[PDB]
């Protein structure tokens, strides 16, 4: 006997889409704040690793958010002002793997 | 002489404003993690302890943490997502976390 996608099924799929957008936005927000603080450290790398697991962020999406933040001129300016010119080695290594 | 007679304001720092944007970023970062975790379902010890590591790194006080929890547990949209994702018991542990410690 057949079955098919109901409105509830499509509703649950849409909730998953909304959740995934919230999760990626959350993770990107943490990367942005950490990048603006200065360079990446091992402790922050570890913390990001746990956050990516709990927010279901793939390594591909992680690396792309690291690069986005390293390259964002506003965040780079904040790091320059707050921490000084050394601010992105280590983030850039992480964004390469 | 060595120094410019027409100083290009390009060179100037904006330390006060950057300090404020950094703080805005930190608070927005923590709030967004609370909101996403709340939309997943109820709080777990693993989420609580991870939020504790995040609050250290983002300089978030325990008062601000609990206020974010109370906000998120009561957000109608985040709660609708959690009920659809995780079922009807998606709030009690969050509400405990929002209330205790004073």
From Swiss-Prot, chain B:
PTM comment, free text: O-glycosylated during cytokinesis at sites identical or close to phosphorylation sites, this interferes with the phosphorylation status.
ENT domain sequence ranges: 18-102
Compartment list: Nucleus
Role description: Regulator which is able to repress transcription, possibly via its interaction with a multiprotein chromatin remodeling complex that modifies the chromatin. Its interaction with BRCA2 suggests that it may play a central role in the DNA repair function of BRCA2. Mediates ligand-dependent transcriptional activation by nuclear hormone receptors.
Additional comment: Defects in EMSY may be a cause of sporadic breast cancer and higher-grade ovarian cancers. Overexpressed through amplification almost exclusively in sporadic breast cancer (13%) and higher-grade ovarian cancer (17%). Amplification is associated with worse survival, particularly in node-negative breast cancer, suggesting that it may be of prognostic value.
Subunit composition and interactions: Homodimer. Interacts with the transactivation domain of BRCA2. Interacts with CBX1 (via chromoshadow domain). Interacts with ZMYND11. Does not interact with CBX3 or CBX5. Component of a nuclear receptor-mediated transcription complex composed of at least ZNF335, CCAR2 and EMSY; the complex stimulates the transcription of nuclear receptor target genes such as SOX9 and HOXA1. Within the complex interacts with CCAR2 and ZNF335.
Protein name, UniProt field: BRCA2-interacting transcriptional repressor EMSY
Species this protein is from: Homo sapiens
Gene name of the record: EMSY
